[PDB]
Design a protein around this motif. Structure first.
Motif, short mmCIF file in Angstrom:
data_model
loop_
_atom_site.label_atom_id
_atom_site.label_comp_id
_atom_site.label_asym_id
_atom_site.label_seq_id
_atom_site.Cartn_x
_atom_site.Cartn_y
_atom_site.Cartn_z
N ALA A 38 -5.05 -0.68 -1.28
CA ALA A 38 -5.35 -1.32 0.07
C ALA A 38 -6.51 -2.18 -0.56
O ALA A 38 -7.06 -3.14 0.45
N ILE A 39 -6.96 -2.26 -1.03
CA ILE A 39 -8.81 -2.96 -1.14
C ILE A 39 -7.91 -4.67 -1.36
O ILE A 39 -8.91 -5.07 -0.51
N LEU A 49 -1.54 -6.40 6.75
CA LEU A 49 -2.64 -5.30 6.66
C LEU A 49 -2.49 -4.95 8.33
O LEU A 49 -2.42 -3.64 8.84
N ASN A 57 0.98 -2.61 8.40
CA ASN A 57 -0.11 -1.31 8.25
C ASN A 57 -0.25 -0.93 9.22
O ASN A 57 -1.04 0.53 8.80
N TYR A 58 -1.21 -1.60 10.48
CA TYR A 58 -2.04 -0.65 11.31
C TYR A 58 -0.94 -0.15 12.57
O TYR A 58 -1.33 -0.44 13.66
N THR A 65 -8.39 -9.75 4.14
CA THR A 65 -8.59 -10.12 5.33
C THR A 65 -10.56 -10.11 6.57
O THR A 65 -10.35 -10.77 7.17
N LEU A 96 -5.70 -6.20 0.18
CA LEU A 96 -5.91 -6.92 1.82
C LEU A 96 -6.82 -6.44 2.52
O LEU A 96 -7.04 -7.74 3.36
N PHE A 97 -7.34 -5.32 2.22
CA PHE A 97 -8.60 -5.30 3.13
C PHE A 97 -9.94 -6.15 2.75
O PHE A 97 -10.83 -7.34 3.73
N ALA A 98 -10.08 -7.15 1.43
CA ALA A 98 -11.29 -7.42 0.89
C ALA A 98 -10.99 -9.11 1.49
O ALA A 98 -11.14 -9.69 1.77
N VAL A 139 -11.19 -3.10 -11.59
CA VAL A 139 -11.24 -0.90 -10.47
C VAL A 139 -9.82 -1.21 -10.74
O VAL A 139 -8.68 -1.89 -11.34
N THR A 184 -11.27 4.62 -8.54
CA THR A 184 -9.83 5.33 -7.04
C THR A 184 -8.91 6.02 -7.37
O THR A 184 -8.34 5.58 -8.29
N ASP A 185 -8.24 7.07 -6.58
CA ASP A 185 -7.08 7.15 -6.60
C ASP A 185 -6.22 5.49 -5.96
O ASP A 185 -6.75 4.68 -5.84
N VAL A 229 1.35 -1.40 0.02
CA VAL A 229 -0.20 0.57 0.27
C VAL A 229 0.73 1.45 -0.48
O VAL A 229 1.76 1.56 0.77
N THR A 269 -3.31 4.54 -3.26
CA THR A 269 -3.72 4.17 -2.93
C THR A 269 -4.27 2.81 -2.16
O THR A 269 -4.23 1.80 -1.94
N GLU A 270 -6.13 4.05 -2.49
CA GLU A 270 -7.01 4.09 -1.97
C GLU A 270 -7.21 1.72 -2.63
O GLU A 270 -7.05 1.27 -2.42
#
Lengths: 387, 387
Positions: A197-198, A263, A266-267, A204, A200-202, A161, A190-191, A123, A193-194
């Motif tokens: 991140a998709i 992820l 990254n937090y 996770t 990883l969030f999907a 995407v 999208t922009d 990311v 960096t967004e």
């Protein structure tokens, strides 16, 4: 329009995107291995994918392969970068060298080509590399493909995407829609960096769902309840659904264990409890499963077919109980210091408890000593995590 | 068949089930308040529900109400128990007294009636009460109704679950299907304790989803990213979906906060990380939201419209910053030691930061000082958690 699209990286992601686009545009695949280039030019796929093989051999594709970078990149409108990358959770190192080498080569040879990165990257990668090199012609677009079904997944994608909001981003999305069989494919711009991140969030979230239904299953086993009755009743809520709800020994594979950890790293500076718990929950589930098997006091534990089951094996061995493995695909006689047994009957006779990710007709014979928490592994139309 | 079904408890759960079943069978509603019994017999609903009111007034229902227990229970084939219960998370006490009083009354008056508990009860309640009283005629069936739309939800249910596997359980499910408008309703028969665990696991999963998308949103705010771009891309995975993915100040309401804690208490002896993290995550999210507002150094914080937002207010007040509330439905001039302001213009002028669960046209005027993480609150067809 009839564009030139170069594929840099001929694994399943690059080749499935190249074959998809070669139905309507000029596609040139760059690979330094001459034998693969020759195979490709002889319309033979170097990878196992039924549809890629069929399309290469039977459809009139404007597709060719070359080992020459100049021949490949010159006059390309887009270059799809699909070279290998790897994230190491222990060191939090994401190796992007192959992608950075292609960005160097394309920038030198054809600075007007627009690079679309399909390789997995960290990311923030694309915004940072554009700033670092002082270039603008790099865009990230996630790939949602399954190895072995990669062209199929490009012909019927969940969504497209593209990580830039611009007309040149939209023209690339149009290439992907033109080649697809599925119509009116959901498309999102999208922009940068967004977009990165998709996945990883999907991924996770999918690990979270496996972990949650596995904690429901730990409770059902502990309380002597029927897990399937509870899960079926829960999943009949349309906001929950009958998918990714199959109890197991833990989520695994080459994706979920690493992405959940990536992820979480990254937090580091973002308050959270769920992100960290998804990682911890898998260790807790493996401990619970191993403890259940050890409570039966087996003298030998058998593993029927061969990543989370490996974590169970580690825990059984840590207690000094031998493990034997039944796995016909394995030719060696030892795997991680454990014997591999070739004869099924001998394996069944020696194992005091047989653990598996799925009940099999072959084990009906010894079901009383088979331990599996699987509920949907034999329903071929059921959608869940598998590794 | 033309059965007699008695409703014991005339709130939305009991009355919506009674009206549904009165289209085809004889339904008798028991309530000790004479005024409500009289209203009901005058075909006036004592509760706010458009469809219950319409059906009572316009359809030929075999429905009546009585204050007499003997008249109500005698000759009933089924008695639906829908009396009030309450779980207190601080003490882990589940008050089931009203249900136990009805079980006592029915057992005495008509020991052959089959009781169907629709009231919320603790996991294990029905198996334990049957053993305790030495009776067999009690079955739990979860209700999945929304207050205000309860008859509608019984006419179009997500599913019907009855916690007994038997012909008398199936005949009750048939009553529910016969009265419904929706056809081929998913129907599941389970054992008792499994049925009682379904809503806790379903509601805790919905809280988990709200908590997860809220942690995604904490990350997006921290990293200066567009939350909607990431969430839209993630939710286009069909195994994830575009529902219950609306960032907020925390999950809330009268259900999710209590059920998540009730389930966590039930895990006292079951290893877990996700169940405990769902509870902790909400506190962490409220801390993150309050910290964000406090970083803007407001001298007065305004709350536009009035449970998780109350948690934010507590944290702002703990730092000695006054909070004012704009809430036309509220008649008092103070709520939890904070002024309620009647004039919107005065409220907007005094508040340095205005927090809300949804952007409203009324705040367009002052959008620069409005803080909301809501993304889908103004999309009337979007399905998400709301309290």
């Amino acid at each position: 329009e009839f564009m030139k699209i170069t594929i840099s990286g001929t694994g399943y992601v690059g080749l499935s995107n190249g074959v998809l686009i070669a139905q309507n545009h000029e596609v040139v695949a760059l690979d330094i291995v001459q034998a693969k280039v020759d195979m490709l030019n002889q319309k033979i796929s170097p990878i196992v994918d039924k549809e890629i093989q069929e399309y290469l051999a039977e459809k009139p594709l404007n597709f060719r392969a070359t080992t020459d970078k100049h021949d490949a990149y010159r006059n390309a409108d887009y270059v799809i970068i699909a070279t290998p990358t790897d994230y190491d959770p222990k060191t939090n190192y994401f190796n992007t060298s192959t992608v950075e080498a292609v960005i160097r080569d394309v920038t030198e040879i054809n600075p007007n080509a627009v690079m679309i990165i399909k390789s997995t990257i960290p990311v923030g990668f694309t915004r940072d590399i554009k700033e670092r090199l002082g270039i603008d012609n790099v865009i990230f677009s996630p790939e949602f493909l399954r190895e072995g079904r990669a062209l199929y997944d490009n012909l019927h994608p969940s969504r497209i995407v593209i990580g830039e909001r611009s007309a040149r981003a939209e023209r690339f999305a149009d290439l992907l829609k033109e080649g697809a069989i599925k119509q009116d494919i959901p498309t999102l711009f999208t922009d940068s960096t967004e977009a990165e991140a998709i996945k990883l969030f999907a991924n996770t979230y999918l690990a979270l769902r496996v972990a949650y239904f596995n904690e429901l299953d730990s409770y059902a086993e502990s309380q002597g309840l029927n897990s399937k009755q509870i899960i079926e009743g829960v999943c009949l809520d349309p906001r929950i659904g009958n998918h990714y709800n199959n109890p197991s020994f833990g989520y695994g594979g080459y994706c979920l264990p690493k992405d959940t950890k990536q992820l979480l790293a990254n937090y580091e500076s973002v308050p959270n409890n769920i992100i960290a718990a998804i990682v911890d929950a898998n260790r807790t589930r493996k401990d619970f499963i191993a403890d259940s098997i050890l409570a039966r006091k087996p003298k030998v534990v058998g593993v029927y077919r061969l990543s989370s089951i490996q974590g169970i094996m580690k825990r059984i061995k840590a207690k000094g109980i031998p493990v034997i493995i039944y796995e016909p695909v394995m030719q060696e006689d030892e795997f991680f210091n454990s014997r591999v047994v070739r004869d099924l009957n001998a394996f069944k006779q020696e194992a005091d408890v047989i653990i598996s990710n799925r009940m099999a007709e072959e084990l009906a014979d010894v079901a009383d000593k088979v331990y599996t928490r699987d509920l949907f592994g034999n329903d071929l139309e059921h959608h869940h995590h598998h590794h």
